Design a protein around this ligand. Structure first.
Ligand SMILES: C[C@@H](N[C@@H](CCCNC(=N)N)C(=O)O)C(=O)O
Length: 254
């Protein structure tokens, strides 16, 4: 390899978004550039809509995906992933005045690879509390997959971008959402978003998968090995921790 093209969405701050001049910026961009430097390969970031990001990779329109993409079982059937470059649990989001905020959380950290009867009872509690609550999620995410498979009785609306989910939640068109702590903590840390709050268990595993990784075609075994070596080195020297703190305001590095 001499040069690679990496696709990103550009609508998922602080992973990948656009600055004042319309340039692609964020954790995924800074990390992507750092990894390519370690691999001694020219880096080119391209904007690609979330809907179609995976089929455009398999069609060979670019070499990789760095777009806050979770390493999840459904995606693993289609593409390969690098080892994770960020780890994050999932949690719920609502408004600061919502009665949903008064809900008792019996299980703070909820791993879903295996669901015990106790863990199922907690999921069932939230399901019943959410019956009548209007949820919004971004389409094609593990957030959508969770709500559709784990909480099918809950009314869900799917959106093209997470920005439109947040806009509808602020306007009161939806009552709650679901996303990672890595997305929600920087969102709610903004003084702009004092009217928004995280709540509920912090979930990991199951359909959420095992970390955020670089999406690569299954046949591109060499490129995966190059990315895995670069990620191991970027984690080891504290580069991932440094970039995580810079973009997220906390350490989400593996
Ligand atoms: C890290 C991120 N992962 C989700 C949402 C990704 C949406 N990506 C994008 N809009 N560029 C997933 O893999 O489905 C999250 O849970 O918050």
């Amino acid at each position: 390899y001499k040069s690679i093209t990496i696709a990103t969405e550009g609508s998922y701050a602080p992973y990948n978004f656009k600055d004042a001049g319309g340039k692609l910026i964020g954790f995924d961009i800074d990390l992507g550039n750092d990894l390519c430097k370690r691999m001694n390969i020219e880096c080119k970031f391209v904007e690609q809509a979330w809907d179609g990001i995976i089929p455009s990779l398999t069609a060979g329109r670019y070499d990789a995906i760095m777009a806050a993409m979770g390493i999840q079982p459904a995606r693993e059937k289609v593409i390969a992933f690098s080892r994770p470059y960020l780890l994050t649990p999932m949690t719920f989001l609502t408004t600061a005045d919502s009665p949903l905020l008064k809900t008792q959380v019996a299980i703070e950290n909820l791993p879903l690879d295996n669901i015990t009867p106790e863990q199922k009872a907690e999921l069932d509690k939230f399901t019943k509390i959410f019956e009548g609550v209007k949820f919004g999620v971004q389409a094609g995410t593990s957030h959508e997959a969770f709500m559709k498979q784990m909480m099918p009785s809950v009314q869900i609306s799917t959106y093209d971008t997470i920005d439109n989910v947040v806009m509808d939640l602020k306007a009161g068109r939806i009552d709650a959402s679901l996303a990672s702590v890595s997305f929600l903590k920087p969102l709610t840390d903004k003084p702009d978003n004092k009217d928004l709050k995280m709540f509920g268990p912090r979930m990991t595993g199951g359909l959420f998968g095992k970390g955020v990784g670089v999406g690569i075609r299954k046949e591109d075994a060499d490129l995966k090995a190059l990315f895995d070596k670069a990620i191991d080195a970027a984690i080891a020297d504290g580069t991932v921790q440094k970039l995580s703190q810079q973009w997220f305001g906390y350490d989400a590095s593996p």
